[PDB]
Design a protein. Structure first.
Length: 539
């Protein structure tokens, strides 16, 4: 496509994705609050103009004036039709079934949106019809054959979502009723027959609240943003009596899984095994002390402590911190975690599980930037606290740590679950970190639209481990500390999820307060340091 046209297209897209009214072509993507997920959103939006962005290029060329040259014409179309057939499990799906959770049909994410002027339920039914047609993985079922799990993408058959309507206009205990009724949706998924999508519409005095629960096997944080965008688009089309029409599909979860399994056994990938040998040298097996001795920890006993930053502090973190060492947000949040764990438990070395969005550019001819599915990656990161005091050293060390492996560590569970046994490198696949870390990113641009906003009846973070009714209460917890971060209403929230039987709340409160203090110190340090890097350090 023409340069000047590509420039105008990028300006439009960046303004929409970053939520900024006017963006100039020399404005820096990350200074404007861009991040890894917003880069994927840009790629998704470009796909609809038949343009292609390699998201790694945004890091290298972070202004429109630079980046325009690296935007390419799409040289291929993804499946636009109804995807059907068996699909191989992807690594986090193998992880899921390996856990053999009690009542594993109850293991969901959820969200609730709010429209003061109400939703038209007949329109919503048409919209969700289109959504489950368009986003094929939502139609998945999971069967048993020869004792082995078989994942199948249904076509347009059976029921693809359940939809319930509740008139609460004469209730004055709306919050309680919403929790009770939505909990019954959350625990009613049947993985073998479907649907995996459960929707409730709550009519109240202050307007309508739209609750959605989706089994985690077919969704993730990026996917929810895609669904919110298409809900808003479809609803607006229908409410104005226009034909419902969504953006072109990117590559199917089916096609992705096929190519991923091939990648898992490719020589180019196997060659990366040496980058993982460092894990074999973590033998300290550091176990954190608990307040109480306990066994068989279940979700019903999980609680959390939360910290938050101010809007002003969060703006610094999102717009004026990464420029110091050319970091991404995980570099900063994990450097804080290291300091906090050292102060809190006198820990000098510990392994954590790091979650990521998993939408890495590992496959040439694939584009999953607008695909709904569970793409999350996870891998072990060893935090090493040596210096202290030399923040420059500790930040640069953590940056090096997270770049010691390719593609943000997506390869670890690919090796673990997909690579054929003979070819599999000898890594410590038995490693089970006690601490999980997941930063989910920014949502305000996704959830606060012209059509709807966040529901005041939402309790906590519904996309995290503490989301109310998300997880079967009798299911086993699998982390001692489950640390989740996200931006909501302009503020960073970090939550520390723990087992009530394992720790006193005060003990976790201590960790959380320490984490905030170290994070604020790191933010202030980085704000002071100017951007002077010439060339990168990424893997």
């Amino acid at each position: 496509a023409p340069r000047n046209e590509i420039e105008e297209t990028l300006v439009t897209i960046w303004q929409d994705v970053l939520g900024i009214e006017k963006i100039g072509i020399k404005d820096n993507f990350y200074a404007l609050g861009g991040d890894s997920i917003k880069a994927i959103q840009v790629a998704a939006r470009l796909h609809s103009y038949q343009l292609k962005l390699e998201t790694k290029d945004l890091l290298k060329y972070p202004t429109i004036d630079q980046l325009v040259h690296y935007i390419k014409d799409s040289k291929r179309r993804s499946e636009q039709g109804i995807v059907e057939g068996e699909i191989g499990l992807t690594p986090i799906q193998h992880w899921f079934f390996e856990q053999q959770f009690t009542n594993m049909h109850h293991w969901n994410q959820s969200y609730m949106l709010y429209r003061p002027n109400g939703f038209d339920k007949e329109i919503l039914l048409r919209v969700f019809n289109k959504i489950v047609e368009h986003h094929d993985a939502l139609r998945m079922i999971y069967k048993h054959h020869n004792g082995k799990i078989v994942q199948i993408n249904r076509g347009l058959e059976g029921t693809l979502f359940d939809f319930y309507t509740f008139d609460l206009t004469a209730n004055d205990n709306e919050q309680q009723v919403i929790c009770e009724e939505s909990a019954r949706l959350q625990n009613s998924i049947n993985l073998e027959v479907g649907p995996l999508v459960k929707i409730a519409l709550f009519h109240t005095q202050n307007g309508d609240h739209l609750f959605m629960a989706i089994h985690h096997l077919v969704v993730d944080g990026i996917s929810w943003r895609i669904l919110f965008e298409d809900l808003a688009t479809a609803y607006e089309q229908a409410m104005h009596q226009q034909t419902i029409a969504l953006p072109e599909k990117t590559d199917s979860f089916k096609d992705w899984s096929i190519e991923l399994e091939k990648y898992a056994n490719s020589e180019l990938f196997l060659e990366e095994a040496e980058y993982w040998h460092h894990l074999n040298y973590y033998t300290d097996n550091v176990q954190i002390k608990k307040d109480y001795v306990t066994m068989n920890n279940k979700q019903k006993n999980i609680r959390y402590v939360g910290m938050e930053l101010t809007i002003e502090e969060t703006e610094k973190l999102l717009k004026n911190v990464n420029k110091a060492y050319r970091t991404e947000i995980n570099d900063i949040l994990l450097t804080a975690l290291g300091f906090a764990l050292k102060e809190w438990a006198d820990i000098d070395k510990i392994v954590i599980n790091l979650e990521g969005h998993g939408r890495e550019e590992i496959l040439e001819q694939m584009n999953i930037a607008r695909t709904v599915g569970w793409f999350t990656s996870q891998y072990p990161v060893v935090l090493d606290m040596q210096k202290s005091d030399d923040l420059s050293y500790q930040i640069k060390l953590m940056k090096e740590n997270l770049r010691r492996i390719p593609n943000k560590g997506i390869g670890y569970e690919i090796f673990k679950y997909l690579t054929t046994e003979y070819l599999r490198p000898v890594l410590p696949f038995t490693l089970k970190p006690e601490i999980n870390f997941n930063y989910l990113g920014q949502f305000d641009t996704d959830v606060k639209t012209e059509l709807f906003t966040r529901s005041p009846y939402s309790m906590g973070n519904s996309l995290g481990p503490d989301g109310k009714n998300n997880l079967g209460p009798e299911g086993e917890s699998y982390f001692v500390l489950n640390i989740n971060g996200f931006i909501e209403e302009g503020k960073l929230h970090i939550t520390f999820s723990y087992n009530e039987q394992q720790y006193k709340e005060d003990t976790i409160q201590q960790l959380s307060r320490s984490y905030k203090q170290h994070l604020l110190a790191i933010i202030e340090h980085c704000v002071q340091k100017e951007d002077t890097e010439l060339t990168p350090s990424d893997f």
